[PDB]
């Protein structure tokens, strides 16, 4: 049975990225929509459109490719897992790939990037690394 919908979302993105085609659909959720917006703001996704009929979903993602069809996201990783949770303090916020990648952190004032958190000096649960 499904136990980690955030990990399922991340693996859909990675699986459809590696085979290099240009759409993807998932059942919706308040957290996945948050990280879809964060993925859109930084430049990994091209767009995101919200359909909704009679159950939770859905969310459509439009991937993005280089000028010679090379990939802008190269991998993607789930950090906190149901079974071993990872909490970070305001001075422990991580810097993935020397700033060339982002981390995603949930705090008392939103689900935000790792820059926006070490500018506010808070910490929380660590969702993912995307580099």
């Amino acid at each position: 049975v499904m136990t980690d919908p955030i990990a399922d979302f991340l693996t859909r993105i990675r699986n459809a990225n590696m085979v290099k085609h240009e759409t993807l659909e998932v059942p919706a959720s308040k957290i996945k929509r948050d990280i879809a917006e964060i993925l859109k703001r930084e430049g990994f996704i091209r767009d995101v459109e919200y359909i909704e009929d009679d159950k939770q979903g859905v969310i459509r993602v439009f991937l993005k490719y280089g000028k010679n069809e090379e990939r802008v996201i190269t991998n993607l990783k789930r950090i906190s897992k149901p079974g071993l949770r990872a909490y970070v303090k305001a001075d422990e916020v991580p810097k993935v790939l020397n700033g060339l990648g982002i981390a995603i952190i949930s705090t008392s004032e939103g689900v935000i990037t790792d820059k926006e958190a070490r500018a506010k000096n808070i910490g929380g649960e660590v969702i993912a690394y995307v580099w």
Binding site: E42, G43, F44, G66, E70, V72, L97, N98, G99, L100
Partner: protein, 163 residues
């Protein structure tokens, strides 16, 4: 692409190997050579060749070694970020280092690293130590190094926005 072999290149032997083939009667013996090639400015290639004597072998290997070359980016004598290169049972981790610290790296990987002009870097081999596969894994890990400009170009951003 092809970095074409038209430069000032300082080669280096990394290994040799007495290799046989049993035939009717007795035994044949050749010599296999492993060589690196570079200019200590950021272009490094490896190549191997075999012959019946050691000079002929090392020659054919430098011949082979020059046909391949990699770009090896860096940001002031230090690799841009941290990579792990894996190729068939050889795992090699590489980290950015501090200014004037040197190269702390093992036998095969330090040849590769020094002939590309790397000055300050730390390494470790979490794998097997067969020279060929160590060299191949190291080159496999340099190819993952990303420039700061290219990332800013691929995304819709500028630099000094993501650093």
């Amino acid at each position: 692409y092809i970095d074409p072999k038209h430069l000032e290149l300082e080669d280096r032997v990394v290994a040799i190997n007495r290799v046989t083939k049993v035939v009717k009667g007795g035994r044949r013996l050749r010599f296999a050579a492993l060589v690196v090639v570079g200019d200590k400015n950021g272009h490094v290639g490896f190549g191997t060749g075999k012959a019946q004597e050691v000079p002929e072998a090392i020659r054919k290997a430098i011949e082979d070694a020059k046909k391949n070359l990699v770009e090896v980016p860096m940001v002031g004598s230090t690799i841009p970020h941290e990579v792990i290169g894996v190729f068939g049972g050889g795992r090699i981790l590489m980290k950015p280092a501090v200014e004037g610290s040197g190269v702390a790296a093992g036998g095969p990987v330090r040849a590769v690293l020094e002939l590309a002009g790397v000055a300050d870097i730390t390494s470790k081999s979490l794998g097997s130590n067969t020279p060929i596969n160590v060299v191949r894994a190291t080159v496999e890990g340099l190819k993952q190094l990303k420039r700061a400009e290219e990332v800013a170009a691929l995304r819709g951003k500028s630099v000094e926005e993501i650093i």
